RNA sequence: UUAAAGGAAUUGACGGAAGGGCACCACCAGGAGUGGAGCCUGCGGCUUAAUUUGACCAACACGGGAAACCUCACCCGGCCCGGACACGGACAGGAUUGACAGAUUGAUAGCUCUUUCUCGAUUCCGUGGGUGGUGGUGCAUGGCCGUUCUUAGUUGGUGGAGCGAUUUGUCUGGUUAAUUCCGAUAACGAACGAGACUCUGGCAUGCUAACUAGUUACGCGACCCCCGAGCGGUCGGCGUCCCCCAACUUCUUAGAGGGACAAGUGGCGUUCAGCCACCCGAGAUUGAGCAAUAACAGGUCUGUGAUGCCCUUAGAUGUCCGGGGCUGCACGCGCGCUACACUGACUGGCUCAGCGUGUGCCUACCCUACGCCGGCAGGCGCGGGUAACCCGUUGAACCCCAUUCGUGAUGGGGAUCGGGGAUUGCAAUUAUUCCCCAUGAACGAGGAAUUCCCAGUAAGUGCGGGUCAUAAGCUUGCGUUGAUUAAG
């Protein structure tokens, strides 16, 4: 409530954002067309290094 | 909403309409009236000021001792 | 305000080589990000660019709390006359990109 | 002004200085995760931030 | 600086798209903005716009896009050129319900009748395909105690989860 | 003396009017108990320089408000302009800033004053002006929330009935959690609301997958072994993705899919909708989220540059700074902890989990392992962790076995209260918190009345978020232990 007045109401605003996982034992030019190959908003991949 | 105790008024200046600090002598000649502040950017600048018997630059902030 | 005069040219002469600045509504707040060299405090840019929209130069709007700027026809050709300015020294609204 | 006591106290630790990141309320906010909004403001950009309802 | 824990990266770009909603809502209020779009890159970045009027949010060569996107370089800390936005005509204009509200605020700010504006723009989300809406109009109207007009037409689900997808509240 | 009184039909609301249904915000049957006692906290009152303020089932642990100052409005006092822009004069033969000394003050505020330098047209003054406002008005409003209202209701079109308001549709019944169905029919055909749906809880010895999860197998290491053997017992001891010097998915994580539908068998009823148990089965009502039409002069202008109007505008309701109050006590009221023992309490052993948070663009300060100094609170160095990667198999409490105590206002209770020790911080004083020794009050099961709840449920029991520098008797989640009574 934005003020104090109510009868006690609890919302529950959960958010569950979920995670999997590859190896790869490639060299890291083409690391670079493992990136731009979708425009997809909806993903956030991040790139391990390679330096082994 | 009365305040009978007058809480004071704003900061006037001194407003006094004299500076004339170069006297002139035997056809032109040069007088430093007060000292000039020593600093190490306002060498013959500025002037250092006067009070009675201390003195302390208006500008640069250090002092001269009380003598 | 203030209006230090050297400094005045410090806040002018990035709101007149680009059309933008991105002052934040907090007055106590000790530096000015974007200029971050000429040791200017927060404070004046709103206290400047109030006196840039209320001659009719600059327009603004109001963010969540942060405030924009965007320069009118009159502000852009007063401030190259207000800097000693020719007219090819141009504002980055003109043309920039290809 | 006189920049000897103007903000002479300590704006930290407590609430004199966790503000809202909206527009500025020191009444009951939300330091978790830097979201730093109101509580009344959080049902204004619930469906926006990725906290979606009961699900 | 030093990178950053996940679930603030997740509210990270979540207060990223509550931003400049806020501002380009003050911004582009007056020609159909209809919500931004964000899609981000490791190089140039890319956000779209979804207005009704493309010829207002352009400029003469681009003008009200490249400051509209220099405030949002100089407000959140994007490098030199890493971002652009782009204007696109969204789809059956008359059918995003947030587009006409801002085309209906002028409708009342033009200085028609409340009921003149009402039914305008209901009939007009009708013959755009529409299977149902509907429009409250609460507030001060002729008088002094403030009493609502709602004007619903066709059919309307309320309740369970697809009142999240088939409809849109504005 | 007065603009209605009076008639008849209609929709609502109501009745200590009849019929029929439902609810643990209702009862019966029962337990937990509050009201009794201590206390923490909230509201009234009184008192005060102020004890700022909103709300009186749907107010009273509420303003996500557990305030030392900040926040903060209220009180006492000291500064600042952060009163844009437009008008004229004062601005070049002396407009406007700043500042050391000192009697200045709460004050290293140049506030004022004596004295006197510096700043550079920025301004100051006069007048119109925005402006800011935790200033009024939620009975001018927007958003939102609360409620009758979680109970089963609401509506057009099109016909029929009626001068007409309206009505049938939306029904006698049978049944249902339910206008939910059957069927009955001047009504027929539809929309919401219910349901469906999303999440969650439960079975997948099926499927796909695992150096951030594991199991099994093996080689090594170490102990034990009647005896002395080990394919014997123990190991969260080590190694088997390091370029193979092992496979595999039961347990961990999810991902899709499968799974229950009232299907089968009987008794019922118009062999209609369905109900009653039984058999198979993990399960034959998992629990919550969203939630209609039409509304209340519900609350909030103190979240909001959502906001109309009024008020206030530099001797400011603007705003900074220090102190006081938001905590004061002949009294009452409401949530809530501990109790009032022997089913207990001590002391020493033995012991098993889930939910989840964690280093910052601003804001600088997090989770902690270990090591070494302290009888405790603690202190220093060394590390790991932006996290299934570290805390961490989260060795939680209750419990269990082992000893001490025996119905004693007692070792039950630990209020009250003295002194000392540390940590937090700009500041602990009106006790922040934590620790020690000492002090040892009522309280001996609770008046009239009243709440909450029926299956992992009430309850005892702890941990974890949120407020956080210090902070939980509060709230919101978690798991453990686990019920008596009910099917009306
Ligand atoms: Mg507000
Ligand atoms: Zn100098
Ligand atoms: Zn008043």
Redesign the interface.
């Known amino acids: 409530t ?1 003020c104090g007045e109510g009868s006690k109401t609890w ?5 569950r ?1 979920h995670k999997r996982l590859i190896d790869l034992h490639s060299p890291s030019e083409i690391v670079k067309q493992i ?1 731009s190959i979708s ?1 997809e ?1 909806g993903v ?1 991949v991040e790139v391990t290094i390679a330096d082994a | 909403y009365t305040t009978p105790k007058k809480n004071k008024h704003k900061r006037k200046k001194v407003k006094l309409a004299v500076l004339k600090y170069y006297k002139v002598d035997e056809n032109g000649k040069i007088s430093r009236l007060r000292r000039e502040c020593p600093s190490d950017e306002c060498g013959a600048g500025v002037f250092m000021a006067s009070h009675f018997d201390r003195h302390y630059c208006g500008k640069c902030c250090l002092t001269y001792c009380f003598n | 305000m203030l209006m230090p005069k050297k400094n005045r040219i410090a806040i002018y002469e990035l709101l007149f080589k680009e059309g933008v600045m991105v002052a934040k509504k907090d007055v106590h707040m000790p530096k000015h990000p974007e200029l971050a060299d000429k040791n200017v405090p927060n404070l004046h840019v709103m206290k400047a660019m109030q006196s840039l929209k209320s001659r009719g130069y600059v327009k603004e709007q109001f963010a969540w709390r942060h405030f924009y700027w965007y320069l009118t026809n009159e502000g852009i050709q007063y401030l190259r006359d207000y800097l000693h300015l020719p007219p090819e020294i141009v504002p980055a609204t003109l043309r920039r990109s290809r | 002004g006189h920049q000897q006591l103007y903000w002479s106290h300590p704006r930290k630790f407590g609430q004199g200085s966790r503000s809202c990141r909206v527009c500025s309320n020191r009444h009951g906010l939300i330091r978790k995760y830097g979201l730093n909004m109101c509580r009344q403001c959080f049902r204004q950009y619930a469906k926006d931030i990725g906290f979606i309802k009961l699900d | 600086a030093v990178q950053i824990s996940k679930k603030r990266k997740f509210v990270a770009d979540g207060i990223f798209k509550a931003e400049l909603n806020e501002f380009l809502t003050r911004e582009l209020a007056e020609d159909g903005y209809s919500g931004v779009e964000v899609r981000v890159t490791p190089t140039r970045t890319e956000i779209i716009i979804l207005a009704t009027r493309t010829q207002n949010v352009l400029g003469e060569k681009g003008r009200r896009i490249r400051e509209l996107t220099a405030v949002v370089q100089k407000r959140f800390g994007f490098p030199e050129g890493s971002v652009e936005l782009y204007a696109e005509k969204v789809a059956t204009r008359g059918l995003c319900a947030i587009a006409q509200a801002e085309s209906l605020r002028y409708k009342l700010l033009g200085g028609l009748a409340v009921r003149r504006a009402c039914y305008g723009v209901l009939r007009f989300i009708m013959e755009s395909g529409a299977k149902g809406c509907e429009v409250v109009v609460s507030g001060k109207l002729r008088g002094q105690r403030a009493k609502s007009m709602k004007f619903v037409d066709g059919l309307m689900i309320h309740s369970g989860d697809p009142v999240n997808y088939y409809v849109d509240t504005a």
């Open positions: 934005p919302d529950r605003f959960q958010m954002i990136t425009i908003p956030e």
